[PDB]
Design a binder for these strands. Structure first.
Length: 96
DNA sequence: ATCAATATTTTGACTGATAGTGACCTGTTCGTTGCAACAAATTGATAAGCAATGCTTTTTTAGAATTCCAACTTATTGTAAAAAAGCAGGCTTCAACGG
């Protein structure tokens, strides 16, 4: 699984950047994105996807184990709509 | 031409920088490690994305024009002694107007 460790190492052998800043950029990368989502801003990354924010209302739910119907509290989640470019590169993938 | 005193002739004390290694402190990097975070697994009513593909709107894109940055290659131009006037910063007196 791709981790921040592998991402930093990549920037070291592709951009020749020290692992230090290579590890600091990967952190600030996801950080800045999370700061935009929490602030209520859409994140549109061309050639990748789009992190949307939809306010879901309180809908009926339950306890998957027993079956006790419990109303799922409303909350703002963070969806991800992959671009057409990304889909065309993952359409022919393979779980490995 | 020889006394006699002061600047002269090498050494030593004075005071903090010069010299080069070493300890001090801890960012920074790497190995050991703990733990919040992530993933599998349920069950079932309700919400969101989905197949194709040309036209329209929004965002990223590769130059290319433009102008300061820059190491070179040209294009023109060229004065000083020797006098002897020409101006203002402030203290100095005569000459005209008013009591």
């Amino acid at each position: 699984a791709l981790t921040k460790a592998e991402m930093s190492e990549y920037l070291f052998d592709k951009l020749g950047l020290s692992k230090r800043d290579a590890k600091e950029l990967v952190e600030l990368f996801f950080e800045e994105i999370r700061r935009a989502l929490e602030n209520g801003e859409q994140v549109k990354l061309s050639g990748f996807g789009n992190f949307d924010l939809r306010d879901k209302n309180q809908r009926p739910g339950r306890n998957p184990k027993t079956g006790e119907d419990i109303p799922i509290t409303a909350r703002r989640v963070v969806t991800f709509r992959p671009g057409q470019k990304l889909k065309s590169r993952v359409e022919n993938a393979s779980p490995k």
